[model samples]
Target chain A: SVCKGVSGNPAKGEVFLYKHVNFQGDSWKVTGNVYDFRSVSGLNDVVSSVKVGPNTKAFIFKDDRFNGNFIRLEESSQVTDLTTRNLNDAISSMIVATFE
Target chain B: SVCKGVSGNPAKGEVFLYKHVNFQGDSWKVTGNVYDFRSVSGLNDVVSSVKVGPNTKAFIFKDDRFNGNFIRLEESSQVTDLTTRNLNDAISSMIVATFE
Candidate 1:
């Protein structure tokens, strides 16, 4: 496995979290709602950037179980640097889905 | 570019500056950083809301030339209201940038 979008999930609407900016460093490609980051081990509070897949929204939260201030992103709308937003290395959980 | 130097750093986005809360009234699409908003003619000290673009950060400053107090807004950020932070119609400069 290389730095590629994960399979076994929907081809689109996935969310990728990276340890560094520009989607560099270690990463985790999430396919569904993650109530907590413990499910992804190394991706807890060290995520520095993200790659949001097409046609879906990625709701990243500050606290576990999706409770706290969140950033809602859609489209290929990925954020490379979380520092400017004071969110670098601070995201703990996420939710990826379409408007249902 | 990762292991193959083939894919990475898709830097694409913009910042929309609005003159009213809730993104109402006049607006302008800023494609790059604004060291000073006076260059935008009628935008200095009158912006109220902002629509940060995909994968970019919008740093709104209270003083010109990227100085003084600021609010760091990232992608997926739609500041429909700026007054809560006492930043409404008080932005004088801005910086738009990407990670790495």
Candidate 2:
């Protein structure tokens, strides 16, 4: 199972803790804080976003093997609807996806 | 081939040169500087340990289209493991890679 973020819930627009944990994707519930993190949050489709005000750590898990989902980081702290190829930036964090 | 590290070596545990290199697996001896760097520091099989002191820039190269090789970056002065997925974290510098 893949996981991301530190041990806490950050406020909106703040900054997620550095040195977070990252692993392969799996199916389970994740908890943590997120701040100044950027990437496409959620399943597939195509969207842009900005990580603003340290949001709660992104907890995502899938019990089924799924592919075709892409996530990209941005340079801003606000979550917006952007594409994967276009979101060319570092969120100073982990972007993990569950594959099973 | 993938190389990582800076232009100099830092003091003991002072801090790995801010940023380092990341890339795919290859066959070759690398050259470079690393301060307080850590990781597996070699080929596969699996060994337990940590990264310390300054390390030279890793210079690696391979030909004949190798496969099943791997490289992981340390937490200190590192952007991410030597994976294309990590092309995200911009190492204040860029690690060079070549394949034959």
Scored by DockQ, the top model is 2
Candidate 1 residues A1-100, lDDT tens each? 1134333332465777788897778877776566567656577788888777665556677877555676656556778798867788888767565421
Q: List model 2's recovered fraction of native interface contacts, to 2 decimals.
A: 0.00
lDDT of each: 0.66, 0.24
The sequence of per-residue lDDT tens digits that candidate 2 reaches over residues B1-100 is: 2233433433332223222233223222232321111221433221121122232111111211111122323222333243343322222211111111
TM-score of each: 0.45, 0.20
Alpha-carbon lDDT of model 2: 0.24
Question: Candidate 2 regions off by >4 Å?
Answer: A1-66, A74-77, A83-100, B1-38, B43-100
